[PDB]
Amino acid sequence: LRLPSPEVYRFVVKDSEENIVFEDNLQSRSGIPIIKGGTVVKLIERLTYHMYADPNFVRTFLTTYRSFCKPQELLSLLIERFEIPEPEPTLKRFRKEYVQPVQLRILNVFRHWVEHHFYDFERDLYLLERLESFISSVRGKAMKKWVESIAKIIRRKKQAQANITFESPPPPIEWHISKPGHIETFDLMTLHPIEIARQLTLLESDLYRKVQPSELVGSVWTKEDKEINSPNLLKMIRHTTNLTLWFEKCIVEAENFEERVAVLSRIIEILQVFQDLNNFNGVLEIVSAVNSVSVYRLDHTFEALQERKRKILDEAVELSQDHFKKYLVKLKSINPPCVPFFGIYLTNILKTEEGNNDFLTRHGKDLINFSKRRKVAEITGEIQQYQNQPYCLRIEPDMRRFFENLNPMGSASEKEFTDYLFNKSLEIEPRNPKQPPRFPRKSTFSLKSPGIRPNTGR
Numbered sequence: 463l464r465l466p467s468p469e470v471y472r473f474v475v476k477d478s479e480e481n482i483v484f485e486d487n488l489q490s491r492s493g494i495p496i497i498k499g500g501t502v503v504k505l506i507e508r509l510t511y512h513m514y515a516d517p518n519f520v521r522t523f524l525t526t527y528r529s530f531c532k533p534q535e536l537l538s539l540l541i542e543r544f545e546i547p548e549p550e551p552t553l554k555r556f557r558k559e560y561v562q563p564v565q566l567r568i569l570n571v572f573r574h575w576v577e578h579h580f581y582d583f584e585r586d587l588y589l590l591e592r593l594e595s596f597i598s599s600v601r602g603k604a605m606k607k608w609v610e611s612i613a614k615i616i617r618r619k620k621q622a623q624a625n626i627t628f629e630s631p632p633p634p635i636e637w638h639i640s641k642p643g644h645i646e647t648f649d650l651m652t653l654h655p656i657e658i659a660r661q662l663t664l665l666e667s668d669l670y671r672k673v674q675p676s677e678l679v680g681s682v683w684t685k686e687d688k689e690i691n692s693p694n695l696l697k698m699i700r701h702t703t704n705l706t707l708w709f710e711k712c713i714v715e716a717e718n719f720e721e722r723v724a725v726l727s728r729i730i731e732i733l734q735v736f737q738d739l740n741n742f743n744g745v746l747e748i749v750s751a752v753n754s755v756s757v758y759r760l761d762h763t764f765e766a767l768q769e770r771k772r773k774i775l776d777e778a779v780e781l782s783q784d785h786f787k788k789y790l791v792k793l794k795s796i797n798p799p800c801v802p803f804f805g806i807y808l809t810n811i812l813k814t815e816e817g818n819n820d821f822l823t824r825h826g827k828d829l830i831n832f833s834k835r836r837k838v839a840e841i842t843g844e845i846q847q848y849q850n851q852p853y854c855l856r857i858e859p860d861m862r863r864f865f866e867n868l869n870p871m872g873s874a875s876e877k878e879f880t881d882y883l884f885n886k887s888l889e890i891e892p893r894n895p896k897q898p899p900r901f902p903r904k905s906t907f908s909l910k911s912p913g914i915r916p917n918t919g920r
């Protein structure tokens with residue numbers, strides 16, 4: 463009874479379809495009403511509601527909010543929420559049934575915020591200055607525990623900001639023609655295919671484990687705030703592009719037909735080791751390379767593959783068909799560790815982003831579509847389940863450095879570079895029915911694969 467005037471406290475404007483929308487269905491009957499959308503004011507209100515706790519909304523909100531609210535603005539709204547004015551009189555119930563419950567719900571939000579999304583503060587020291595200054599100003603007797611708990615989390619995050627443990631013997635590193643410390647001799651064909659697969663899998667596992675759901679929500683990696691909203695996603699996308707184009711480049715620049723067949727075969731071996739390692743990211747990067755317009759059209763090179771190499775490629779390619787029907791089946795059947803195919807989460811998020819309005823309307827004046835953010839958090843959520851299981855393989859630092867530095871494009875555009883691959887493809891297997899032209903090798907190394915049975919393994 464008796465809140466302050468909406469005129470001095472924007473959160474207590476009356477609930478109407480002007481400001482807030484709930485799901486009206488059989489699920490929303492029992493218990494905590496389910497939010498479909500509202501003004502950001504109204505969503506903040508319900509994020510810190512006096513009448514009940516809402517752990518599920520707090521989790522979804524803090525995962526998704528960056529698609530509709532800046533971190534600086536969220537802090538401003540939680541402080542605005544916190545600074546609750548006195549009701550209009552002619553306080554004791556107001557203070558214990560409204561204020562204290564609301565202020566604890568705010569401090570609970572801050573606690574989830576610094577616990578699970580401290581990257582927001584790592585990305586913006588000013589954001590953290592504002593949070594530290596505000597939290598240190600809270601002198602409420604019952605607030606004390608919460609304030610201490612938030613301080614302890616910030617201390618732990620700052621520590622680990624400044625400050626690999628094998629649970630079983632990892633396999634011995636495999637060497638082919640390229641020997642350790644000879645990084646200048648590192649090529650697709652001089653490195654061991656087993657170790658190429660292992661070190662790309664370690665690189666790709668590391669890139670994949672660093673991606674936060676929030677880097678995907680509201681397709682933020684394509685918007686202009688992407689380098690800050692999606693740094694880990696964009697490293698992973700740039701990796702995929704560089705490795706996919708490196709495989710294409712290795713195939714199409716092998717002018718000598720025998721060499722090119724040996725190169726395509728070696729790639730397919732690498733694909734088999736990716737499959738053994740449940741690195742489906744790796745599998746579908748190679749699939750991506752071999753269905754590329756510049757490599758797809760090399761009918762003579764494909765034809766000359768051993769039927770067994772052909773078979774492994776066909777099975778891999780089929781994982782991708784019918785909207786990755788078989789990949790999705792395979793992914794649910796394997797034992798981690800694994801690197802999921804990252805592309806399909808991007809695709810399925812673009813479809814969900816594109817297909818749902820960011821807003822319910824402009825008649826209520828920016829009613830945020832929250833249910834849209836819930837559906838995307840279900841997709842980003844699936845990412846999480848394979849991020850907590852590391853590979854029992856050893857880093858080969860110079861191989862790691864080679865693969866981290868892959869730059870097939872050089873200074874050219876993606877476009878300039880894919881035009882080049884295509885002009886090269888037409889040169890090496892022209893659009894005529896004559897046998898493929900016969901070019902000399904420029905490389906001297908044996909074409910012979912050591913295969914994908916471990917050698918030093920034993």
Ligand SMILES: NCc1ccc(S(N)(=O)=O)cc1
Pocket residue numbers: 752753757758759760761762764775776779
């Ligand atoms: N050059 C014919 C050709 C290219 C590539 C494939 S695939 N999709 O990689 O199995 C199949 C045939």
